[PDB]
Amino acid sequence: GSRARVYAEVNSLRSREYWDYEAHVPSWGNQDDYQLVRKLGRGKYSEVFEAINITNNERVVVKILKPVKKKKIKREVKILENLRGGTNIIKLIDTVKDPVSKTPALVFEYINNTDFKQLYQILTDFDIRFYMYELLKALDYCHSKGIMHRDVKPHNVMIDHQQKKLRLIDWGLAEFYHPAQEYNVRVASRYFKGPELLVDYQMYDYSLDMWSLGCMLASMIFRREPFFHGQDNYDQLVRIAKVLGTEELYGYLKKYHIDLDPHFNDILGQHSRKRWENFIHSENRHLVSPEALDLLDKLLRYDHQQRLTAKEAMEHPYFYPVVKEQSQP
Ligand SMILES: COc1cc(Nc2ncc3ccn(-c4cccc(CCC#N)c4)c3n2)cc(OC)c1OC
Ligand SMILES: [Cl-]
Numbered sequence: 030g031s032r033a034r035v036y037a038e039v040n041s042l043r044s045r046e047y048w049d050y051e052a053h054v055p056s057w058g059n060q061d062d063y064q065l066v067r068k069l070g071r072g073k074y075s076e077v078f079e080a081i082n083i084t085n086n087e088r089v090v091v092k093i094l095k096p097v098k099k100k101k102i103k104r105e106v107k108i109l110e111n112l113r114g115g116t117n118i119i120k121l122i123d124t125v126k127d128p129v130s131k132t133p134a135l136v137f138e139y140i141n142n143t144d145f146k147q148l149y150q151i152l153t154d155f156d157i158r159f160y161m162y163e164l165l166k167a168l169d170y171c172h173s174k175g176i177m178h179r180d181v182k183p184h185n186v187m188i189d190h191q192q193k194k195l196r197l198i199d200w201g202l203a204e205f206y207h208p209a210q211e212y213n214v215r216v217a218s219r220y221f222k223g224p225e226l227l228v229d230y231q232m233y234d235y236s237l238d239m240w241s242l243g244c245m246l247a248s249m250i251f252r253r254e255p256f257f258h259g260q261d262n263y264d265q266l267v268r269i270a271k272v273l274g275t276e277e278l279y280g281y282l283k284k285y286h287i288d289l290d291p292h293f294n295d296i297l298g299q300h301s302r303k304r305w306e307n308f309i310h311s312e313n314r315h316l317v318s319p320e321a322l323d324l325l326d327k328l329l330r331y332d333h334q335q336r337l338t339a340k341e342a343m344e345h346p347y348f349y350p351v352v353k354e355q356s357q358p
């Protein structure tokens with residue numbers, strides 16, 4: 030068995046109403062209050078449009094939800110309501126339906142986001158520390174509120190690089206953590222899936238998000254994006270094992286009594302645990318420090334229970350420059 034090291038009992042200590050999302054009843058307003066301007070993106074079960082609120086000329090974003098169980102919609106809405114006002118959590122402004130189609134939609138604050146594929150390549154050492162610290166604030170907050178995001182990746186982190194404002198978005202895969210609950214492993218996006226997901230270990234927790242965050246950190250400081258570039262879910266674990274080593278993998282599986290899909294027998298091979306310094310070269314050297322490598326080593330661990338918590342990560346020396354700069358000249 031496995032239990033989160035932090036925030037394990039959060040939900041059981043709260044009113045049932047807090048976590049019993051199936052009982053939540055959203056109030057659906059009129060989407061006619063919003064003029065859609067342009068498409069910003071899409072997902073498996075949504076598309077998102079920039080919009081103007083006709084009544085007050087506020088620029089917002091409208092996420093039109095594609096056909097899903099009402100249950101998944103209630104989950105996302107209740108989670109967003111529970112996290113509202115939290116540090117660096119996207120603000121849910123309203124829940125609306127189009128009168129003709131009857132299609133439900135969520136309205137969020139607009140962030141003047143720079144595409145990560147443009148942004149990450151101009152970030153300084155300090156900028157990476159700063160934004161990673163901001164994202165950690167969001168994760169410590171949601172974890173403290175009993176919620177796992179389960180889809181941390183650059184696409185889900187909106188950054189206004191002028192305002193220095195970061196928001197964690199797309200809470201559609203987020204879930205309430207309950208100790209000993211077995212969860213579906215078909216979460217996250219391939220390059221950000223923790224080893225627990227890839228070996229079908231269901232008793233995971235908030236620490237899944239910390240794997241994903243470590244993947245982001247590695248891509249930012251080393252400039253190899255994505256960092257672990259699997260061709261499929263099987264190959265994803267092989268790419269991880271080429272860095273973290275196979276001995277440590279087999280150790281992890283034995284510790285948690287995880288049976289390894291035998292398709293891995295012929296593709297994993299035997300790999301040493303690598304030095305993180307191996308990834309340094311002339312074009313990324315300025316973004317790498319001993320502190321960054323120590324943090325990465327403590328996030329990207331097979332054993333989910335051994336990974337730093339969001340708060341432990343915030344306390345790491347890598348972020349000392351950020352903590353110091355929070356008092357302006
Ligand atoms: C993403 O690109 C851009 C995004 C934004 N701004 C923005 N602000 C808030 C939210 C909330 C959800 N979203 C979103 C958008 C697209 C897709 C998804 C994923 C779920 C679905 N479908 C969420 C948001 N996007 C601005 C831009 O330009 C100013 C962009 O262009 C760079
Ligand atoms: Cl979203």
Ligand SMILES: [Cl-]
Pocket residue numbers: 319320323324346347
């Ligand atoms: Cl250190």
